[PDB]
Amino acid sequence: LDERGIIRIGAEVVAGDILVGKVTPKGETELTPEERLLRAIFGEKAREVRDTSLKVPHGEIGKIIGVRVFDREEGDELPPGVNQLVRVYVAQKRKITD
Amino acid sequence: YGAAYALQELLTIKSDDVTGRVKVYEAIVKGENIPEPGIPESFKVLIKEMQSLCLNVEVLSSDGMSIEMR
Amino acid sequence: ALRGTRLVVTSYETDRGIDLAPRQAVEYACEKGHRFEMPFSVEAEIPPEWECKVCGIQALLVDGDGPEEKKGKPARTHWDMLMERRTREELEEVLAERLAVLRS
Amino acid sequence: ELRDRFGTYFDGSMGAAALQKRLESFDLEEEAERLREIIRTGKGQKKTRALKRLKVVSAFLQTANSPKGMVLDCVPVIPPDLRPMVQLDGGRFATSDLNDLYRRVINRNNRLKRLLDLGAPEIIVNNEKRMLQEAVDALFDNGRRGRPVTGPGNRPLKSLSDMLKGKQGRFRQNLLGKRVDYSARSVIVVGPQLKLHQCGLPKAMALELFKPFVMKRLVDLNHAQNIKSAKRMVERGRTV
Amino acid sequence: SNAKNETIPRPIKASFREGLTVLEYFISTHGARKGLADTALRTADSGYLTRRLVDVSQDVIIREEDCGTERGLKLRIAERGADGVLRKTDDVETSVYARMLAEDVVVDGKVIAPANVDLGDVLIDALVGAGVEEVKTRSVLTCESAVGTCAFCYGRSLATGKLVDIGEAVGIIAAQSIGEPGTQLTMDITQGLPRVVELFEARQPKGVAPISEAAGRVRIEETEKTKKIVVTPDDGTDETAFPISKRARLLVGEGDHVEVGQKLTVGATNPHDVLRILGQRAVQVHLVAEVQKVYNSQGVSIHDKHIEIIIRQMLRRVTIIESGDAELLPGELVERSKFETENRRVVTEGGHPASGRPQLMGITKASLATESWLSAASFQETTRVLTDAAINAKSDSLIGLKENVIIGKLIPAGTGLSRYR
Amino acid sequence: AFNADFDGDQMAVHLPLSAEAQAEARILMLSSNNILKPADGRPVTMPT
Amino acid sequence: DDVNFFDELRIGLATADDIRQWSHGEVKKPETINYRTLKPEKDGLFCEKIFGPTRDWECYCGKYKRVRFKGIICERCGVEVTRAKVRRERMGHIELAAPVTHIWYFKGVPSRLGYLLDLAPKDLEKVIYFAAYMITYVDDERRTR
Amino acid sequence: TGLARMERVVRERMTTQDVEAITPQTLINIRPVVASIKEFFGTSQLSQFMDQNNPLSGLTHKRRLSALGPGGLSRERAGFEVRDVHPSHYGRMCPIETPEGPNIGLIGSLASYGRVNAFGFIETPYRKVVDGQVTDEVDYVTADEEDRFVIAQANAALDEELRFSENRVLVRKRGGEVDYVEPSDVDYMDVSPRQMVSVATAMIPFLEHDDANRALMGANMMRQAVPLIKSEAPLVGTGMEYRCATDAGDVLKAEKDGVVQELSADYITVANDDGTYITYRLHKFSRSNQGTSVNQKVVVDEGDRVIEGQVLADGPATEDGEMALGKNLLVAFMPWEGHNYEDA
Amino acid sequence: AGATADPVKDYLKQIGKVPLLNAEQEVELAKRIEAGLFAEDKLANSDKLAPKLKRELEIIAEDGRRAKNHLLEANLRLVVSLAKRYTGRGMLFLDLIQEGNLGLIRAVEKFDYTKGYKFSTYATWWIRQAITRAMADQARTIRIPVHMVEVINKLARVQRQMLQDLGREPTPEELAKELDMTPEKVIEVQKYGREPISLHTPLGEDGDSEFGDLIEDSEAVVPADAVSFTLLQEQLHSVLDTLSEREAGVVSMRFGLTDGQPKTLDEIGKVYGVTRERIRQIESKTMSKLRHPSRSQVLRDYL
DNA sequence: GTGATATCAGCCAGATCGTGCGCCGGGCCAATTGGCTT
DNA sequence: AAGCCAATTGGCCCGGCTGGCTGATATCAC
Ligand SMILES: [Mg+2]
Ligand SMILES: [Zn+2]
Ligand SMILES: [Zn+2]
Question: Could you list the residue ranges forming a coiled coil in this record (chain H) (predicted)?
Fold first, then answer.
């Protein structure tokens, strides 16, 4: 991932990899006793924002060809209520197989 | 073929038995006997719709007593 | 793929637990002889009045007092506006003229 | 004119209330006996009509059902989770087309109550009652009588009946045949080295089909310490 | 053929090796496309037919080892040839093979075929050598079992080569076997799959050929835009008049003598007339032969028992004509079991036994007039079935396969029987 | 038996779980116990 | 619970008593969800007092929020504390101001109402849809006298 | 349809509002027109997401005659008589290329020489023959005029003095029936053979030796081939590869004659003859609708001279200007240990 | 008689039987209404007049009621005209007509003839008000209050006018400046007015599915997660067993493992009969004990 | 633990005037009329 | 001239626009 959290051009991805890093806030929630006890053990304070990053689906591979990013604050004509958009292109060469 | 148990599991604990899917997963993971199937959710949805149509659908036990499906 | 969620939440709490906080049953009755009991937490303020969702009528406690509540604002009718706009003598003379024409 | 001249000696009514009154004061056994006598003595098309009528007259005569059940005073309401209001990503809400019909019923019923307790000419009350009955009819069966109601895009709404009938109803699509777990699909090639009782699965499909079993097995052999590490190990696709 | 179905009197005198000219290729595209479209539609037609067949006979399962019945069907083997020497009948593999003998066969005081045997080619060859032409075999049509059918009447299970077990679902097997070759049957009178659909639905054929009712003399009447055949029986009863159209091709001349069920015109007999005039056995034979003709035309082999299951399912009810005092309204179809038991109860402490007539009905009507409202609702016409059951307050006992499948419990067949569990 | 060609056809795989389902799939539905055809009794699992 | 005990499936003609015995409460308003907080509106089609809580072991106002408070009707809002899955099992009902016919027993040929009352379908349709009157009673003896 | 609502609104507001303060700008509301245009171009059964497997697929998606859609008919209501190959389709609609699913007969392809009339009918060209002499006058004829005349066959042996030889020529008559006739009644002749076959069906060598079903399958299956990284034109093809590839619009063609000035895998700048310079850009590893790759090669060199219409860059599945959907492989016909058993 | 499948036509043909009215007729009808109402009130008063006076009083009351009914039946046509003016956008024609009828009833209730003005305009005001209120309160599945509906309508009108005059889609800043509100408010108002889609909308050409058949249930119990949580609970109970009885007990009663009820330090000390700070000391010791590089690895994975 | 003030939501009213929504096949039932029957 | 026994045809259904006034809520503060 590069400075703004978008995969680098030329990187090779495999199933489960992260293409774009995204964080979504979730607000106040109550954890189960076991989870709270485990957090107390390891002392990992909750961040209150979960991850919704974009990952390659199962059974997909290939290099990264292009990354196109649109910002609603850069004059792009994004639809209402869409701050930012990003598109990532993955290409792979297939040989003939049974 | 005459295979009743395979059909019953293909219809209950693989599609609709909401409380049975987790139980069967736990049974497989812990290495023990698969539990008996329950009653599928689609039947309950059908009964609810039929009752919503002002039809008095009810299931009876050996004696003429309703079960009420929870 | 399409992702959508109903505005619902789920919890891992076992619900088998080890003990439940004590509750008290308060009894109510209907005007047609239908009766029921409602469970409330002991640390609670009992409401003197309830709605029997079994029969859809107002219900009071077995031994509670019977309160009286008046209308916050009575539903305005035609007659109220007629006093508001027309004077008493105007209505009196209108009625007199109407009675005269009816008699004639 | 007849009412103001001969108001007494008879009671008249209009709408479903008249049918309810007639069904309440109905002598079923007398009608059944009359139909039986006509069948025995009379002949012709009258005999066939009486035979057809006795089938529906006799049912209520003996069984626990009563005719008054054909007219409704209160209408049941299906649980909300069977008519969900789901929130799609982006704020768009998706409904189930039964909320609209229920809302029509409730709105028209409330307006009817307002008109009745307010005092209105018979024309308005009768029109409101007709609209309420049509709303209930559309709720139960849509398009059976008159023209079906439509939403955006001018396509008929789905009613309670439509969910049980047809090739896409509850009975045929969700009950007699369903989707199942632990299932895979793929294109077949030919292997002539196999025996008559053998098949060849690709290892991706086999691994995804047998995931719990392999997790338990590799936990057993100490290839992992717990089911969490076993699941991560299977997902990452190691060698062992 | 042309775009319309009619031969073009100019052939394609060139094979695919020598190459076709432009016009010949264009002419061939006609038949090519027509065949492709017929192939496209046959799939849906056969699927619908098989669904109906499965629905009518889902609950026909084996539930006994032997009913002890002494009855059966007289099946013919070893049709006599033109040389005076018995020759085995052509269709013995699908008529008498995999079937049992109702009664022992004795010729010249020798038992050459004991009762209740598989009746393979060895026994048939021995019987033909001994010089017999008829055998009284056991069929489901004549099973006296109280519950369902029994293994000995069904006979051998063709899928395994041994006696059918006591939990087999023979009805579904019969439905599937009859319905599978539907796509192979390439679609005045119906010829292909529509002919089978017509036969199993007990419909009136297209080219209806009236069949005489009483033996006697026949006379023909001539009039414009009409023809009539009047039959005077030898018994002297009233005349019988059959009207027909001008185009109809006659088969019996004026003053000729006719049999009880002899045809009086070229066409297709309708099952109802043959039933009413010659009993249940005649209609059974007619239906089996007519159904097997369509399949044999395309070289499809299906055993007779599979069709016999459907046929017996189609003849399960009797229509009441005489009121009697059995509480059965006239004109109300009733299962023969209910009618028989009601008559038995009435004859005791009663005077009038109700009388009825056999009724032949199609697979759709038979499968919709069932005793379980759940299966009927799940078949088709859901709204009508439900609004009828609600008024009748019908109670479903869950004794079939579809009901148990719907509610999610062990089907009462195969390994789900309490005998094995 | 499957009426399956090798010009792009696809097939589905299901996994029995319980002991009863496995016993049925192993004793009743096995591939090498189904030589004959239920319709008429002629073999279908035959060199073609 | 156990399908092995299902003995029969009986269908009947539901009456008002059955309809309002199934219901856990009467829905008397047409609102579904608040446009801002997205929470069910009271007495609406999605109310929680009638159809159950929307969150496991939690009431509408939030006074009770734990599994310990199980099976307690929060006096503040009336919602009980239990699993949200009960929203798939609880029915409500609407009390009509005037009676209504069931379309199934009116239109489905043969019209069962017509056969039972011996009324032609056109006459019955006229009566129910407020197009003509209907004499439901008459004093034969008194009028003759 | 949009303008109908627009003018209804215009007249209503003109009547309702005042006068002497009204101008055309404040009477015309163009919302309905744009709304109708948007509705048509989106969620309409005739505005289809394009097919971009290869140049042939794109070219065949155009030239497609669909008999179903808004105002047409339905898939399940069409009978067995509207899907037939009526004898009036000769030269106007292909009888081979149609879908094999439940759409058989309801979608077709325009023939190679077909043309659309002013009223929407389809015309086809015929060479006029007078007094048994095949002239060089081409007349475009519709179905009715074709029924009026008697049409000869494309491959009719001639004496080479523009005159028929055998005196017994197979010709089509009023009802589409074929018959032998003398060389005096004939009045029209086909312009060429393969006048009745579509563009995709004209690229199957030895088509006259193939059953109609197999030719139909081959035509429907040539539209699914994917473009490979290295293209190679067929060794034994038809004469219709270059024309199809160039007319499909996926081959870069010079606009004006000139000499290539500078060249690179991304661009070609040519100095036209009239003094102006023009630079052409090439797609490299783009993406088509179907997920394949669009990539254009260069077939010219720096010193070459190019005339207008010359091909300067290949396409996704072309090789030097002509369609190339596959590769030439050395094939042997024999069974081999059962690995090629039953169509493998 | 002759009920049709189009109730609108039947209602329209039924409301035309009664004729219209004139200004003098309306004035005298209002006079009759007022006289009847006043006479009915006077009768309702306790004092009792002569029987004949009460009889004529009832007669005039009946006449006034009939006059009111006639007036409403006459103005039904005006109600229908306003309704058809407001037709569309959410409500059916008959619903609008009924709301207009209620508004007309209110207008007749709140009407005075002293002004001498034609009764039509007052009823028009009231009918329009009632129809607008009802439409704002019943035209959406997710109800929006009247003021927010007004804001949404004004924003839509301004946006349409800007699009027409300018010829280009207005950017949010332009609308914010013209409407005199922040861009965030404009965005929120835009997001409020959207109408929901249906789960039964077909999406495939064949029609084998609906739009609601691919909506993933994002609030169900994933069996893998449930079994993982159960294994975590078992492992936690096993690990807490290795500790001493006192330490495990204090941890359990501090995090409420057994009952789910967290407890304060003082209560724990009370049950243990020790100081609050001492109890706090024990919790820290156990917390560090579990977070050690000798017992952590049995619990690291589950975190 | 309160406490002031802004929005948040629901309800009510105005007067000139204004008066009519915007494909096929198969099975069955019911209305009509020819032709008897009295 | 009234009533009934049939045929005939038509139809239906089912299978593939400001404004004012008041109490409750919240949101920042003490
Ligand atoms: Mg294949
Ligand atoms: Zn038997
Ligand atoms: Zn609460």
Answer: none
Q: Tokens in use for I66? A: 């009939």
Cβ atoms of D156 and D148 within 8 Å: the answer is yes
Q: Report the SS3 class of residue B18.
A: helix
Tally of CB atoms within 10 A around A45: 6
Amino acid (1-letter code) at residue I157 = R
Say how far apart CA I79 and CA B16 lie, in whole Å: 54
Q: Is the CB of G110 under 7 A from strand J?
A: yes
The separation between CA A91 and the C-alpha centre of its own chain, rounded to angstroms, equals 19
Residue in I with minimal Cα distance to D99: I141
Shortest alpha-carbon distance between residue D94 and chain A (Å): 18
Gap between the Cα atoms of D134 and G103, Å rounded = 9
Residues 6+ apart with CB under 8 A from E88: E77, E78, E124, E125, E128
Tokens at I146, concatenated: 């009247």
Closest partner residue to G9 (CB to CB) among B38, B59, B70 is B59
Distance CA E261, CA E273 (A): 9
Characterize the bridge pairing of strands H252-253 and H115-116.
unpaired
Alpha carbon distance H208, H214 (integer Å): 11
For residue E180, the chain F residues in CB contact (below 8 A) are 39
Distance A63 CA to K27 C1' (A): 52
Residues 62-101 of I with CB under 7 A from strand J: 74-75, 77-78, 80-81, 83-85, 87-88, 93
Q: Which two tokens stand for residue H7?
A: 């003018």
Q: What does the alpha-carbon distance between residue H320 and residue E262 come to, in Å, rounded to a whole number? A: 79
Q: Which resolution in angstroms does this entry have? A: 3.1
Whether D134 and D146 have beta carbons less than 8 Å apart is answered as yes
Method: cryo-EM
DSSP I36: H
Cβ–Cβ < 8 Å for G79, G43:
no
3-state secondary structure string, chain D?
CHHHHHCCCEEEECCHHHHHHHHHCCCHHHHHHHHHHHHHHCCCHHHHHHHHHHHHHHHHHHCCCCHHHHEEEEEEECCHHHCCCEEECCCCEEECCHHHHHHHHHHHHHHHHHHHHHCCCHHHHHHHHHHHHHHHHHHHCCCCCCCCCECCCCCECCCCHHHCCCCCCHHHHHHCCCCCCCEEEEECCCCCCCCCCCCCCCHHHHHHHCHHHHHHHHHHCCCCCCHHHHHHHHHHCCCC
Region at E255 (left for phi over 0; alpha for psi -120 to 50; beta for the rest): left
**Is F touching E (3+ C-beta pairs, cut-off 8 A)?**
yes
Q: Does C12 touch chain A (CB under 8 A)?
A: yes
Q: How far is CA H186 from CA E10, H146, H176, I225, in A?
A: 19, 12, 15, 83
Chains I and G touch, contact meaning at least 3 pairs of CB atoms under 8 angstroms apart: yes
3-state SS, residue G123: helix
Q: Is C52 annotated as a binding residue?
A: yes
Q: E strand or H helix at H264, and its extent?
A: strand H258-264
Q: Which of D76, D212, D216 sits opposite B54 (nearest CB)?
A: D76
Q: What is the spatial distance between Cα G129 and Cα G132, in angstroms, rounded to a whole number?
A: 8
SS3 assignment, position H261: strand
Shortest Cα distance, chain A CAs vs residue I165, angstroms: 21
* D59, D65 Cβ separation under 8 angstroms: yes
H121 phi and psi angles, rounded to 5 deg: -75, 165
Nearest-CB residue to G22 (from D16, D56, D76): D76
Q: Which tokens sit at H294?
A: 């669009």
User: Looking at chain E from residue 302 to 341, which residues have their Cβ under 8 Å from any Cβ of chain D?
Assistant: 323, 329-332
Distance E152 CA to ligand 2 centre (A): 6
Ligand-binding site membership of C89 (annotated)? no
Query: What's the rounded Cα separation, in Å, for the pair I113 and B48?
Result: 58
Q: How far is CA I263 from the centre of its chain?
A: 42
